[PDB]
Symmetry: C2
Subunit: 442 residues, 2 copies
């Protein structure tokens, strides 16, 4: 009954306090230039204290869960709070809430050996070589991450959950003649150890084949099929920030006052839900213990509302939607997403590509870029991108896409049937999206 006594101890110095304990075990392995370059195993604990006294906040962090270290951190936070000035906008920490039912943890990922990762990377090297004798795995990595979080506060909130996720990516470079392709990245992420290295290699090697044939690009107006990585990049930098209630309070979201209005084509449905079947982290509570839920942001093209954490919700007058995420370096809470889902459609990507007379498959946005989430404006470089002519991919190309994400979203005519989990940055679950007649500059 340690943490119970620690809250009692903290209540001597604070009006209210929160204790969050994080535990993890991570295994990783790396490949450099067709050699396994590293395997590692890490595990540890981290405790964060947020204490408030007369609306003055103290926050202390220690990389331990032993009660003496946690007591020291409570004292650290109290001393900081006594040095801080009051935050008049502070109201209170979250109250206990009703949580969805916890899923069963995937304990095989709590005991996984780094050998699993090493062997999947070795297999990827061998498969890539078999499929194209000049294909090289220039870089790659795999990881398995097990996480536990215990959150409690002086208002009676206790929530605990643990679970794991695994991921792998390969970067493949080809050489045919004197052409060297750019690095082609592909990946897999899931909640079990059967990482699909075969699929990674097949897709990456296919895109290398196409990239052996560079074709010039011109100024034109053409359909673009965005892949998951390009969608994640563009939307994370230009669109998702607009859904934050903090920007509503600060008058920096172009979506203010547009609830119920059409901001995208009816083809687009976008929501945040950790309980989606492909989610890597089916968490029932956010990082300050508020229950998570399905938050619909765009419903059949119509803007539905904003996401909130405790602090900004109470400043505004509403309730948190369970979107308080822990800042990795500072230890504070900020508004963020759990699993951003774009709903899928009915036909395969191959059906959609087969019907394009002239167009581009945009797989990544590797290149010079700028974005402004205050109005949605953007300028990106499509790379890698592949020209489609008469329903067939003809080669690789580079071009510029400049415009506005809201205008672009209105050009969406279809979303493919499959969904891909993007593990990096914001976790995003998305299909391919076809946009009609985008103006591109060569």
């Amino acid at each position: 009954a340690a943490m119970e006594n620690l809250i009692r101890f903290g209540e001597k110095f604070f009006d209210e306090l929160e204790i969050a304990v994080y535990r993890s075990r991570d295994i990783e392995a790396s490949v450099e230039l067709n050699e396994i370059s590293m395997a590692s195993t890490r595990s540890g604990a981290l405790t964060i204290i947020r204490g408030i006294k007369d609306k003055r906040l103290g926050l202390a962090i220690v990389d331990s869960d032993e009660p003496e270290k946690v007591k020291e951190a409570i004292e650290q936070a109290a001393k900081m709070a006594k040095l801080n000035s009051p935050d008049e906008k502070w109201v209170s920490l979250p109250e206990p809430g009703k949580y969805r039912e916890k899923p069963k943890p995937n304990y095989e990922l709590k005991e996984a050996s780094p050998d699993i990762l090493v062997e999947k990377l070795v297999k990827g090297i061998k498969l890539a070589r078999e499929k194209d004798k000049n294909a090289v795995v220039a870089g790659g990595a795999g990881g398995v991450s097990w996480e536990e979080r215990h959150v409690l506060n002086s208002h009676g909130l206790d929530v605990f959950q643990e679970g794991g996720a695994a991921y792998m990516y390969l970067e493949i470079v080809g050489r045919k003649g004197s052409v060297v392709t750019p690095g082609i990245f592909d990946f897999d992420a899931r909640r079990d150890l059967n990482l699909d290295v075969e699929g990674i290699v097949e897709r990456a090697v296919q895109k290398v084949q196409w990239a052996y044939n560079v074709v010039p690009s011109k100024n034109e107006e053409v359909p673009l099929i965005f892949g998951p990585w390009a969608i994640a990049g563009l939307f994370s930098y230009t669109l998702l920030p607009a859904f934050s209630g903090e920007r509503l309070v600060k008058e920096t979201t172009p979506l203010a006052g547009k609830v119920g209005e059409k901001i995208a084509s009816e083809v687009i449905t976008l929501y945040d839900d950790p309980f989606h079947p492909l989610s890597l982290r089916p968490t029932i509570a956010d990082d300050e213990g508020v229950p998570t839920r399905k938050n619909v942001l765009i419903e059949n093209g119509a803007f539905k509302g904003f996401v909130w954490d405790n602090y900004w919700a109470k400043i505004y007058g509403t309730e948190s939607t369970g979107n308080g995420k822990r800042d990795i370096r500072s230890g504070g809470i900020n508004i963020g997403f759990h699993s951003v889902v774009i709903e899928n459609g009915k036909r395969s990507l191959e059906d959609i590509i087969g019907e394009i007379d002239r167009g581009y498959l945009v797989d990544g946005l590797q290149g010079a870029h700028s974005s402004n989430p205050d109005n949605g404006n953007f300028a990106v470089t499509a790379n890698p991108a592949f020209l489609i002519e008469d329903g067939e991919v003809k080669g690789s190309a580079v071009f510029l896409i400049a415009g506005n994400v809201y205008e672009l979203l209105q050009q969406a005519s279809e979303v493919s049937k499959e969904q891909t989990v993007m593990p990096f940055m914001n976790t995003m679950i998305t299909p391919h999206i076809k946009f009609e007649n985008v103006k591109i500059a060569g």
Copy 2:
């Protein structure tokens, strides 16, 4: 005799192996918008194993120094070696060498409390408001790091050292009319806890005073006085990589074949020496145990030679210069620097500014930038920068500097008397540098 027995254990699977144990204790504190936002304490141990069998390399990492964990890591590395193909360019690990004398550790940094950092930040906030009621400490941080490293290998190399360093920076923003200044950064770094927060606040607040008066910039040819932060950024991105022996072997340095040629003005002497009086880390050995030394890179404008680690030196036929640095994520060895020193001059910055009819003091390079270390080409945004007219600073400005770092180095006419330690990027110990007739674009 734990680690010697671990070496004997490793010799059953490997022709040769190295064991490196890192231990550290780090405390940090942060400020956001005139509030202390965080204090943290972290400590831990890390062991890296590099084993070679028939020129096949295995590398494993575990976040512990306990003998059982290290034994597991050796087995991990052995399994990786048997999966890898031989590196024909591999020759051997370093032999034992003769080290300079170890300085006595600065033990006061080994157990410092985050309270020290918190109070220096509180004092900085108070000083900033006292000196300018409209000055806000938008961001800042302090840190103390205590590090211990033990390296040994099967050829009989064993070296151990421990020591600590501390740093602090503040970012100060002013508001006078409806003009808000850009973030003005200043810092201090040293091997004791007497961090100079007074000096940081004085310099930053003075620059904020100047930044209240924005003045437009035009295309012209004018002298520039680069400060330590701008020198560190520019040189770390465009110049220092060219001194790497790996790039000499791979033919990607413009300095191939140029030993003895004047690549800079005679005013410039640049060298690598961890035993410099202002060095934060007086290390006697690099991360693979090779003895550390003074490496002169530019002597009175003349290019002297390249820096080497063990692996690339033996490929070329030379010897390591003690410049093998441990990669923070991969655990491998890469060529890097310890403390890059630019030799100082005889007169104060204040004397030098007093003689400029029209010019600029360039303090930061915050803005769009590109660089090519393969030829030294660069394009940066000078920001914050301050206009000098008839020996007096008149206000702040933003302009572009594009060109080639070697051409720029030929323009160096003098260096100030003081030397500042830059803790960020490559640790750099440098004065201000006055460059004659630089072409700038408004």
